[PDB]
C-alpha cells in the first residue's frame, strides 16, 4: 500500500462505488438495452434489462481489478460509462507499477 499515498486509495475506493451506482440508474433507464432472452426468439415481448446492483457493482471491481467481466455494455450511455472507467483503472495500475519500480 506504500507506493500510492493513503489518500488516493480512499478517493479510489469510493470512486468504484461512485461510478457503480450512476451506472445502475442509467442502465435501468435505457432505450436500446431491453432485449429478449430466448435463444431463438420468435418476436416475443419478454424483454428486460440485465443490470442490477450486484451485476453493476461487480463489474466495477472487475474492470478496476484488470480481470475482464461480463455485461458488455450495449447502449451509448452504459458503454461510455465503461469506456471512461477503464481509462481511470488503466492509468492507476500503470501508475502503481511505475512508482513502485
Amino acid at each position: 500500500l506504500n507506493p500510492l499515498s493513503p489518500d488516493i486509495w480512499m478517493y479510489v475506493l469510493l470512486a468504484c462505488l461512485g461510478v457503480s451506482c450512476v451506472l445502475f440508474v442509467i442502465a435501468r433507464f435505457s432505450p436500446y438495452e431491453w432485449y429478449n432472452p430466448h435463444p431463438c426468439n420468435p418476436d416475443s415481448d419478454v424483454v428486460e434489462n440485465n443490470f442490477t446492483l450486484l451485476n453493476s457493482f461487480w463489474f466495477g471491481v472487475g474492470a478496476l481489478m484488470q480481470q475482464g467481466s461480463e455485461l458488455m455494455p450495449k447502449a451509448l450511455s452504459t458503454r461510455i460509462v465503461g469506456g471512461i472507467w477503464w481509462f481511470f483503472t488503466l492509468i492507476i495500475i500503470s501508475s502503481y507499477t511505475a512508482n513502485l519500480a
Binding site: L14, L17, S20, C21, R28, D45, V46, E48, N49, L53
Partner: peptide, 30 residues
C-alpha cells in the same frame, strides 16, 4: 475536503441503494 466529498458520494450511493432495492422488486419479464 476529501473525507467530506467522500461522505457526499456516500450519501449519493446510500440514496440510490435505498432506491435500488425497490427497483429490484419492481420489474419482471413481460
Amino acid at each position: 475536503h476529501g473525507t467530506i466529498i467522500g461522505v457526499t458520494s456516500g450519501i449519493v450511493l446510500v440514496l440510490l441503494i435505498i432506491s435500488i432495492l425497490v427497483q429490484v422488486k419492481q420489474p419482471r419479464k413481460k
